[PDB]
């Protein structure tokens, strides 16, 4: 089926470089825009780069711009130079195609582990962790530095679920729509600045860390995340 398997893990001395590769299969890679998202060993997700279909538009993060270059046989290359101490993170491979009614960021690769020896719309989740029992209702709050309701009428809040030891799965896109394969037990709501992900009939598989991501303007700033521990 659909797959984004990637390699490039290892240990790099400071100031080094590497050409990370993402092997894609099971989908029309040339018709998708491939992202790169990373997680620090303890922190939350953080957008790294973005390459569009046809390589027309390429974006990079504030701390990534210039240093890391993205490129694309069905294989995506993130040509990466001048590795520093802060670059140690589990890089992920994410696909996203944008059209009316699309589901961006829907599939996430298994990730690769790397080690090294002002207009941002910052999203903040006040609750770092929430101890919740199975079968009960849960809620994870989210905020923004600006209103995410664009004039076109779409709020651009995305919700991702990261099970412990597994790749994140797109749960809710555009703050109201439920992605394919996500059970009906997950719901999301919000308006402008305050957003809330509603979980009903909690199960064992729903345990993990929940991330709130905006898409109104690059960089795709990520929230600190809520660790809904069992």
Partner 1 sequence: SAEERAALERSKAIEKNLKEDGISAAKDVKLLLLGADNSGKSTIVKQMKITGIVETHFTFKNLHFRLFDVGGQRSERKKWIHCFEDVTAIIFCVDLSDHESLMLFDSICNNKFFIDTSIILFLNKKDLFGEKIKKSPLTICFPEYTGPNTYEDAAAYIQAQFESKNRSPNKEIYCHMTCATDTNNAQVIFDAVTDIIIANNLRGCGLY
Partner 2 sequence: ELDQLRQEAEQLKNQIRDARKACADATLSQITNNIDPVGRIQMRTRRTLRGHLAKIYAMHWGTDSRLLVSASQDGKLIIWDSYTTNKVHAIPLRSSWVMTCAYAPSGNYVACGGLDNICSIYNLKTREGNVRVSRELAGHTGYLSCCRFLDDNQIVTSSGDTTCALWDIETGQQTTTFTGHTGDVMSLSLAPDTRLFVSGACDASAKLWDVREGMCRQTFTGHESDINAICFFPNGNAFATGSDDATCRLFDLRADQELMTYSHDNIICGITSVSFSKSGRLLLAGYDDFNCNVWDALKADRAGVLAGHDNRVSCLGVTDDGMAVATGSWDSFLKIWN
Which partner from the list partner 1, partner 2, none does 28 bind, CB cut-off 5 to 8 Å by kind? partner 2
Determine, following the binding rule CB under 8 A, whether residue 43 of this chain makes contact with partner 1: no
Which partner from the list partner 2, partner 1, none does 180 bind, CB cut-off 5 to 8 Å by kind? partner 2
- Considering only 47-55, 60-68, 72-80, 175-183, which stretch makes contact with partner 1 by CB under 8 A? 47-55
Which residues have C-beta within 8 Å of that of residue 73, sequence separation ≥ 6? none
**Least gap, CB of 90 to partner 1 (angstroms):** 25
How far apart CA 177 and CA 158 sit, in angstroms, is 9
- Considering only 8-16, 26-34, 57-65, 128-136, which stretch makes contact with partner 2 by CB under 8 A? 26-34
208-214 and 177-178 strand pairing: unpaired
Which partner from the list partner 2, partner 1, none does 130 bind, CB cut-off 5 to 8 Å by kind? none
Cβ atoms of 220 and 64 closer than 8 Å: no
At residue 148's C-alpha, the angle toward residues 46 and 209, to 5°, is: 40
194-199 and 90-96 strand pairing: unpaired
Q: Which residue, 102 or 124, has its beta carbon nearer to partner 1? A: 102
Determine, following the binding rule CB under 8 A, whether residue 72 of this chain makes contact with partner 1: no
Cβ atoms of 195 and 212 closer than 8 Å: yes
Determine, following the binding rule CB under 8 A, whether residue 101 of this chain makes contact with partner 2: yes
**Residue 10 Ramachandran class (φ > 0 left, ψ -120 to 50 alpha, else beta):** left
Q: Where are the beta strands (DSSP E) in 89-193?
A: 90-96, 112-116, 138-142, 157-162, 169-173, 177-178, 186-191
Q: Which residues, numbered 78-97, are part of the site for partner 2 (CB under 8 A)?
A: 97
Which partner from the list partner 2, partner 1, none does 26 bind, CB cut-off 5 to 8 Å by kind? partner 2
DSSP 8-class letter at 54: G
Helix, strand, or coil here: 85?
helix
Which partner from the list partner 2, partner 1, none does 227 bind, CB cut-off 5 to 8 Å by kind? none
Q: Which residue, 30 or 81, has its beta carbon nearer to partner 1? A: 30
Determine, following the binding rule CB under 8 A, whether residue 177 of this chain makes contact with partner 2: no
Backbone angles phi, psi at 55, to 5 degrees: 60, 25
What residues make contact with partner 1 under the rule CB under 8 A? 33, 52-54, 56-57, 97-100, 104, 150, 152, 154, 156, 215-217
């Amino acid at each position: 089926d659909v797959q984004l398997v990637e390699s490039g893990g290892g240990l790099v001395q400071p100031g080094g470089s590497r050409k990370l590769s993402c092997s894609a299969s099971g989908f029309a890679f040339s018709s998708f825009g491939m992202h790169w998202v990373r997680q620090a060993p303890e922190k939350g997700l953080e957008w790294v780069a973005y390459i569009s279909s046809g390589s027309g538009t390429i974006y990079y993060a504030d701390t990534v711009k210039g240093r890391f270059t993205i490129s694309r046989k069905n294989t995506l290359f993130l040509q990466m130079t001048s590795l520093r101490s802060e670059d140690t993170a589990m890089y992920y491979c994410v696909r996203s195609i944008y059209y009316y009614g699309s589901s961006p960021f829907d599939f996430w690769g298994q990730g690769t582990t790397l080690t090294v020896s002002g207009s941002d719309i910052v999203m903040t989740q006040a609750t770092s962790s929430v101890p919740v029992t199975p079968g009960e209702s849960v809620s994870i709050s989210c905020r923004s530095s600006k209103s995410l309701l664009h004039s076109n009428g779409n709020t651009y809040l995305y919700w991702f679920l990261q099970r412990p030891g597994q790749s994140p799965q797109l749960l809710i896109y555009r703050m109201s729509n439920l992605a394919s394969g996500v059970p009906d037990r997950f719901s999301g709501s919000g308006s402008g600045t305050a957003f809330t992900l509603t979980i009903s009939r909690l199960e064992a598989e729903d345990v993990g860390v929940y991330y709130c991501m905006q898409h109104l303007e690059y960089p795709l700033t990520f929230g600190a995340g809520t660790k809904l521990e069992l």
